[PDB]
Design a protein around this ligand. Structure first.
Ligand SMILES: *[C@@H]1O[C@H](CO)[C@@H](O[C@@H]2O[C@H](CO)[C@@H](O[C@@H]3O[C@H](CO)[C@@H](O)[C@H](O[C@H]4O[C@H](CO)[C@@H](O)[C@H](O)[C@@H]4O)[C@@H]3O)[C@H](O)[C@H]2NC(C)=O)[C@H](O)[C@H]1NC(C)=O
Ligand SMILES: *[C@@H]1O[C@H](CO)[C@@H](O[C@@H]2O[C@H](CO)[C@@H](O[C@@H]3O[C@H](CO)[C@@H](O)[C@H](O[C@H]4O[C@H](CO)[C@@H](O)[C@H](O)[C@@H]4O)[C@@H]3O)[C@H](O)[C@H]2NC(C)=O)[C@H](O)[C@H]1NC(C)=O
Ligand SMILES: *[C@@H]1O[C@H](CO)[C@@H](O[C@@H]2O[C@H](CO)[C@@H](O)[C@H](O)[C@H]2NC(C)=O)[C@H](O)[C@H]1NC(C)=O
Ligand SMILES: *[C@@H]1O[C@H](CO)[C@@H](O[C@@H]2O[C@H](CO)[C@@H](O)[C@H](O)[C@H]2NC(C)=O)[C@H](O)[C@H]1NC(C)=O
Ligand SMILES: *[C@@H]1O[C@H](CO)[C@@H](O[C@@H]2O[C@H](CO)[C@@H](O)[C@H](O)[C@H]2NC(C)=O)[C@H](O)[C@H]1NC(C)=O
Ligand SMILES: *[C@@H]1O[C@H](CO)[C@@H](O[C@@H]2O[C@H](CO)[C@@H](O)[C@H](O)[C@H]2NC(C)=O)[C@H](O)[C@H]1NC(C)=O
Ligand SMILES: *[C@@H]1O[C@H](CO)[C@@H](O)[C@H](O)[C@H]1NC(C)=O
Ligand SMILES: *[C@@H]1O[C@H](CO)[C@@H](O)[C@H](O)[C@H]1NC(C)=O
Ligand SMILES: *[C@@H]1O[C@H](CO)[C@@H](O)[C@H](O)[C@H]1NC(C)=O
Ligand SMILES: *[C@@H]1O[C@H](CO)[C@@H](O)[C@H](O)[C@H]1NC(C)=O
Ligand SMILES: *[C@@H]1O[C@H](CO)[C@@H](O)[C@H](O)[C@H]1NC(C)=O
Ligand SMILES: *[C@@H]1O[C@H](CO)[C@@H](O)[C@H](O)[C@H]1NC(C)=O
Ligand SMILES: *[C@@H]1O[C@H](CO)[C@@H](O)[C@H](O)[C@H]1NC(C)=O
Ligand SMILES: *[C@@H]1O[C@H](CO)[C@@H](O)[C@H](O)[C@H]1NC(C)=O
Ligand SMILES: *[C@@H]1O[C@H](CO)[C@@H](O)[C@H](O)[C@H]1NC(C)=O
Ligand SMILES: *[C@@H]1O[C@H](CO)[C@@H](O)[C@H](O)[C@H]1NC(C)=O
Ligand SMILES: *[C@@H]1O[C@H](CO)[C@@H](O)[C@H](O)[C@H]1NC(C)=O
Ligand SMILES: *[C@@H]1O[C@H](CO)[C@@H](O)[C@H](O)[C@H]1NC(C)=O
Ligand SMILES: *[C@@H]1O[C@H](CO)[C@@H](O)[C@H](O)[C@H]1NC(C)=O
Lengths: 117, 432, 432, 119, 432, 116
């Protein structure tokens, strides 16, 4: 069910990411164009951050303890994604910038490793 | 210790305003424009999800309003123009030997109309309702001749409402409150997600909402602000009240041609006796329904105040009378017989008038001529809600005229949200 | 033992109905808009590929039909309307001493038409063809005055057809049968794939297909159901038959202004003699062509069946007679001299009439006024196919009136398919 | 041999022409046609991405082949059959296979996260 | 040793011609369609980047021209069409005893206009300017009657220009030359990249450019080819010259209905004395400005030549006089007092005529009627540049009329480019 | 700073590719959006076919030729901007693309044999 896990905990909700992902794709044309642009913006952000065609990607940016400093198990077991997204909304623009910086550094390092031989 | 992980496909959303598309299974609300229907739509219940709704700020109502206006104009554009008809009319009384309230309501108007050839004129007699004809000094003109040019509706396009399903585009979803006795605002703990709404009929009326949805358990009184008496109060009934509206006369329709490739339809004559149009509402059903409304209204205003109903104070006929489309004819009915009692802690007959020149949607500068329909017209419909306004005694009157409120009474349960499937969360991983 | 492997770019396609777009190298057709010119077309032969075709269900015919109608209406729309011309006419015979077949065919009419200023009127004398003027009781009117408004075509816009190439959007491909003696249905074992079709000229005609494609091997008879006499038979010829048509009279065109910035063009006078339009078809070539058609028909209907031909049974002139556009003039020609014959086991001259009021594609409610052309009109065309209707013995008659039959005659070789570049197959691997 | 040149070729031989098809896949009605072409292209890429097959033309998964899906040996499929015949033969099981592919990829990603989580 | 490496996101571009967006931070120019404003526009200076610019080949000007034409027609279209006004007029002189240079310019023009009803006519007296009325033989008609129908501008839509910003779509960028004394062509070493241009007011005028940009360092003389007499020379001034224009009369505007929903506005009467409209230019400022222009022009023609100026030699009033829109009325002013001089190595007052029938954009077949404005008109503007046409002594005259040159002046600094982010370079790696 | 590195050497500009990567993504606006999307997807498709779908800098197996404006690495990376380099090898652009596609196709087939 689309968004069926929306009220479930973050851990449980992580098991249905495919369900939401597969449903993202004159007025009808305008709406189709905007839907496509939103899809592509999300795909571009995933690519730039170093995340390939995967639902879950782990990166090299450490967690800043000032953001939602409420244990680890409490977040995944007691909260839903709507509550979590609201709690850290004010830091979203910071995290994304850090992710971009990390990937650029990682690519530079990879090229050096590729040059060694 | 903890690391950032990016999750794509996260089941979250944010409030948004977007463009919705139509689906359906000639008509003004044509099904040719769109048919992306779904014989088996799904509803995914969201457990442990509470969302806030506000029916008074719901962009779906404004979008529907524009969609209805656009479809209306698209239907009227490819039709016969009646500009040659705005002439001086020589009008007399159709049937002087009438003693009923009908006497003087319809007139015998003689005028010189353009023929197919531009050189000749034809003398045409036609029968018009007095509400469409104004005296200038005999010597009458059509009521629209100063304000606007009038376009004849195409005789082949039906005015019968057809349910329209609204569907969100990909990336968006529609949240249905699905909560009994929800007042249209505030939190809703039983929200379900759909891609398409149920069908909504674009029924056009004032004062009384016809063929709408019924309350699940009891009469629901919805208002943007109860204290502010300038807002309309939308009352959703628990049970329908059946109304039988008839025009009990056998009308004969005649037509003439005006110019090449054009034809004008006009009310020709009446066979048999001429009788007044009217609507029948059962007295007991209405009295019980009104009592239920009063009890719910007292809950908002207090057990110790008196609730009094009165007829509309004045203004345009579209707002002082009940208005509806029955059989293709436009009926205007006097509702003073219903809102005439005071509440302290057989059949009713409403007379109606028929007019052919309609200024819909309160747009000044445009007008439509509704062609007459041959024969006898009867409709049976359900009254599902009321539009009331407020003046130690609270006085309420019927009202309306702002068509958006008729759609609010149906769209209040739906909200449009945008899906934003990107989340960030802490975990214990180091990429590789 | 075996595992699923996903392959993207798989050479598999399925039948599809999609939108195609025109591509070409002032004209009625929008050849200035559809200019993504292909500098050099290519096709890829598909070896060991058999594809089932059915020309009678090909969506491209419907798309071409709509494209031609929409382009034609867009071209005609921005032009002068002739509403002021639908007036009573005083008409006499143009040449009272003429004894040829044109006697009574051209009338000299006088009428009072609007001048540039609303206050003034002018007396105008003009010539009309009999087919455009109907007597009401002298005292004549234009034939369109009781059914439609008429719009004057812009004299600057040419009606000469220009080949139009239909191109598939990315993800779709056009399959060309490329098989001699293909009858329009069934498998084609020599299919090639193209991005776009060859150019197709939007030639409009009835009964005889002009300037079309030839069948290299033999005459091909194509029908939806040859047994069913309610379906048309399209015959593609092996060789062209040359037809030389002319309007030999030297006409003079005059024009007047009929309003603020608008002008009306009309047939002014005739220099020299009044002569009937006509077409010359080589007699021996036509007889040979019929012999080939008869042999193929006998193959379908039996070696001992006598095949008879007859003239169109009746109805509207546009269907009863042959119709074509030469130079922008519209000719209607009597084909009874071509189809009067029988078959059992020196030039031909066809008389033609000129008509200025054209009602294309069977649409009632629209009409075009074709302006006259000064000088003498001569055109030479190739007859490439016939539209026959079947009535021991069988009788065939010419027919037409549904333009999709001409376009199908050219489109039958092409099919549109969608590419589905994704599939799975077993192999021996384990992902890792 | 060109776009769809291998359409009549055997399944194995046509595997080397996937690249040419990949290149070709990418008034108001021309705009509508462009929008539709883009929508179909992105739907195919999203579907491949969900299965874990991103920058790949040939992608091997760990889902086993069920003999109920019109099994007819292996050498016949690659050496004798063409892609049109094969696609027709197993059309009725296409959706089943797709569902399994999606589930497998999600399970694999979870396993990777747990394996990555171990320090 | 070396291998191919592909780099995505490379900061390179190629010249391109694309569609630009409008933005604005009722008017004739749209405000609801041009909403993507930017309260904090940014620019990125490109250090060590020199680009070649060519204003004469700058596609942005043609696109802006098309945008202005489309907005103009959309604004004017939904308004009253004055077809019934093209009637014979019986005109006399408004004030035969007036002895000013405005004598004979305003006519009485008693005519027969239509009314709300087709059956009735009314006698109307209205004033027209001499330049709008042509004698046919009293017995006058409006000048547009023999070329086009005239559409009345809606009084509710303002003709005041507003800034419009042009913004590139994603994937494109706008390069601003940002280089002092740039002549419009050739290399520009100070390129700075922006997403949106500054606002440009779509001011339309002839001979003198109004309310434009200033040349920060000196007067800049630009032309496609300074040696070719057929190319206009655009002179951008270093400092503005203030021009004070007025219509020094208190006019009364009357309104009558001409049909249902339509009303005609006309010049009713004059309160007080009739005076000639005029513009005041300071003599010293103009003489200084012209001397600066002469010095810069001598730099291209030589220190020993004489530069002579003269008034326009002839052609339509629009080009021979200065033309501008102040308050919604159209002024045509005689500039011979500014260009009557010769250069060898107290206010000036220009008379102006007012006219209501406008044939804008040099399009024959359309016309606009500008309704009169009540009261006295005062308009103050900045003269920012000249349009010169070249004939031992050179003669230059005012010219213009092609609005593209006016927009070329404001747009010479901008170029549109496309990003091609696929770099290829040798590296010391082989992937694996 | 979008295109801020345009006047910088190719080495220095390589570190800033992300800013352009981010910036690359009535009837007039719809046409502009559709064309912008098509151009974006054409570039992404080319990176995809070449096996570079997830990288801003992608190293491959195609050798560099001497005919392709060989100027030494020190001159190319330290003394040239991307605009100048693009001009110097513009005429070989299509050659490079064909080679890149062929290499990736062979590599995938080889992996299929190595996997099986
Ligand atoms: C609330 O809902 C009720 C129930 O639908 C509705 O009453 C219904 O209205 C429709 C249309 O007005 C009625 O349908 C007509 O029934 C008569 C019976 O003879 C037919 O003759 C009509 O056909 C004519 O009109 C058609 C128009 O397209 C023509 O195509 C046709 O050839 C005929 O000329 C038509 O079928 C329906 O019968 C009633 N139902 C009842 C029970 O009366 C009511 O109007 C709705 N409320 C409002 C305000 O509209
Ligand atoms: C089947 O194909 C044949 C072969 O083309 C075709 O005959 C051609 O018709 C055209 C149009 O009548 C001929 O071209 C004309 O030739 C005359 C000779 O003077 C010119 O004056 C014409 O120019 C006028 O008309 C143009 C119309 O577009 C205007 O644009 C122009 O400004 C002039 O007003 C025009 O060039 C052509 O020569 C013949 N071809 C041959 C070989 O005779 C035939 O009409 C086609 N069948 C049908 C039904 O159309
Ligand atoms: C609902 O309407 C009442 C109307 O009375 C609002 O309260 C009034 O607010 C105005 C604001 O200037 C005051 O001047 C009145 O004195 C108030 N009257 C009362 C009785 O409170 C009230 O704020 C509105 N509430 C909402 C949520 O809209
Ligand atoms: C237009 O001309 C007429 C006569 O040619 C002027 O004369 C009269 O003006 C008075 C003004 O109050 C009107 O009431 C009369 O009706 C006019 N005469 C006629 C015969 O109608 C008239 O004044 C002129 N118009 C203006 C604005 O001065
Ligand atoms: C600028 O204009 C001049 C004048 O027309 C051009 O030079 C002329 O070229 C024609 C070509 O047939 C010659 O006949 C004239 O004799 C030339 N005159 C002079 C004075 O040179 C010149 O080529 C133009 N240059 C540009 C860049 O447009
Ligand atoms: C242009 O200058 C003239 C003077 O040369 C101005 O004329 C005077 O205007 C004032 C009112 O502004 C009157 O009181 C004077 O009587 C006028 N002078 C004469 C001789 O009549 C004129 O107004 C100026 N116009 C503008 C627009 O600045
Ligand atoms: C809602 O909470 C209950 C608490 O026991 C839980 O069992 C249920 O699964 C939750 N809903 C969802 C959708 O997870
Ligand atoms: C979180 O980020 C902010 C950025 O302003 C920084 O000041 C702070 O020290 C960071 N905290 C940790 C724990 O890294
Ligand atoms: C029609 O026109 C004639 C003109 O003489 C007029 O007498 C007659 O009254 C007109 N008809 C009507 C109904 O006014
Ligand atoms: C609906 O219920 C909420 C519950 O708090 C209340 O705040 C709101 O005013 C109510 N609205 C109406 C119209 O009764
Ligand atoms: C009135 O409501 C009842 C509720 O079941 C329904 O059955 C009936 O058909 C409705 N009447 C009309 C005319 O729709
Ligand atoms: C034109 O109008 C006059 C008006 O008297 C009439 O006599 C004349 O016959 C008309 N002309 C025609 C051709 O009918
Ligand atoms: C053809 O028409 C005949 C008419 O009798 C019918 O019996 C036959 O089934 C039709 N066949 C096809 C293929 O349409
Ligand atoms: C008729 O067909 C022949 C076949 O080769 C062709 O050469 C000739 O040009 C055609 N005639 C016309 C007018 O197209
Ligand atoms: C068609 O079949 C023959 C049979 O040997 C084969 O040689 C040929 O290559 C096949 N065609 C293609 C395109 O592979
Ligand atoms: C194969 O598919 C059939 C259904 O066609 C099913 O009954 C069977 O269990 C499946 N076996 C495996 C191993 O998937
Ligand atoms: C004329 O230019 C100056 C330049 O500073 C400006 O301040 C002034 O407002 C301009 N005048 C008008 C009317 O725009
Ligand atoms: C421009 O060149 C100088 C050296 O001549 C260099 O230092 C500077 O960084 C360059 N500009 C940029 C933006 O890199
Ligand atoms: C370099 O390019 C030339 C172009 O003709 C070609 O002949 C040569 O083989 C190429 N060499 C390499 C190593 O790519």
């Amino acid at each position: 069910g689309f968004l069926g896990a929306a009220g479930s905990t973050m851990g449980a909700a992580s098991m249905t990411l495919t369900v939401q992902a597969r449903n993202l794709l004159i007025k009808q044309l305008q709406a189709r164009v905007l839907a496509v642009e939103h899809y592509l913006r999300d795909q571009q952000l995933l690519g730039i951050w170093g995340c390939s065609g995967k639902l879950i990607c782990c990166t090299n940016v450490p967690w800043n303890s000032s953001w939602s400093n409420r244990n680890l198990s409490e977040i995944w077991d007691n909260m839903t994604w709507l509550q979590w997204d609201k709690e850290i909304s004010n830091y979203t623009q910071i995290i994304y910038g850090l992710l971009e910086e990390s990937q650029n550094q990682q690519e530079k390092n990879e090229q050096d490793l590729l040059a060694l031989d | 210790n903890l690391w950032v992980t990016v999750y794509y496909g996260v089941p979250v959303w944010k409030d948004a305003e977007t463009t919705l598309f139509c689906a359906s299974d000639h008509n003004v609300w044509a099904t040719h424009a769109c048919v992306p229907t779904d014989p088996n739509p799904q509803e995914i219940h969201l457990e442990n999800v509470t969302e806030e709704f506000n029916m008074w700020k719901n962009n779906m109502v404004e979008q529907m309003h524009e969609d209805i206006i656009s479809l209306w104009d698209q239907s009227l554009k490819p039709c016969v123009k009646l500009t040659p008809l705005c002439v001086t009319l020589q009008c007399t009384n159709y049937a002087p030997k009438l003693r009923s309230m009908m006497r003087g309501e319809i007139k015998n108007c003689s005028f010189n109309m353009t023929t197919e050839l531009r050189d000749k004129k034809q003398k045409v007699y036609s029968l018009f309702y007095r509400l469409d004809v104004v005296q200038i000094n005999k010597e009458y003109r059509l009521i629209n001749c100063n304000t606007s040019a009038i376009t004849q509706a195409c005789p082949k396009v039906s005015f019968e409402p057809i349910p329209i399903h609204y569907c969100a585009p990909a990336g968006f979803a529609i949240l249905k409150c699905k909560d009994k006795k929800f007042n249209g605002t505030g939190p809703c703990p039983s929200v379900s997600t759909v891609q398409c709404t149920h069908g909504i009929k674009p029924v056009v009326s004032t004062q009384l909402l016809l063929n709408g949805s019924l309350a699940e358990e009891e009469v629901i009184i919805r208002s943007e602000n109860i204290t502010n008496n300038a807002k309309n109060i939308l009352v959703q009934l628990n049970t329908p009240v059946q109304i039988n509206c008839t025009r009990p006369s056998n009308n004969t329709v005649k037509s003439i041609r005006i110019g090449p490739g054009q034809a004008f339809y006009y009310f020709g004559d009446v066979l048999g006796h001429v009788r007044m149009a009217h609507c029948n509402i059962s007295k007991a059903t209405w009295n019980e329904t009104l009592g239920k409304v009063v009890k719910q209204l007292r809950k908002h205003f207090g057990n110790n105040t008196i609730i009094r109903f009165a007829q509309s104070s004045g203004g345009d006929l579209e707002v002082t009378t009940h208005s509806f489309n029955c059989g293709g004819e436009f009926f205007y009915c006097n509702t003073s017989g219903l809102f005439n009692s005071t509440w302290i802690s057989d059949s009713l007959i409403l007379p109606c008038w028929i007019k052919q020149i309609i200024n819909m949607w309160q747009r000044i500068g445009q007008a439509m001529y509704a062609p007459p329909i041959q024969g006898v017209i009867r409709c049976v419909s359900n009254i599902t809600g009321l539009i009331l306004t407020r003046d130690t005694t609270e006085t309420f009157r019927p009202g309306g005229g702002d068509m958006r409120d008729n759609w609010r009474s149906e769209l209040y349960k739906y909200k449009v949200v945008k899906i934003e499937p990107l989340g960030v969360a802490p975990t214990r991983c180091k990429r590789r």
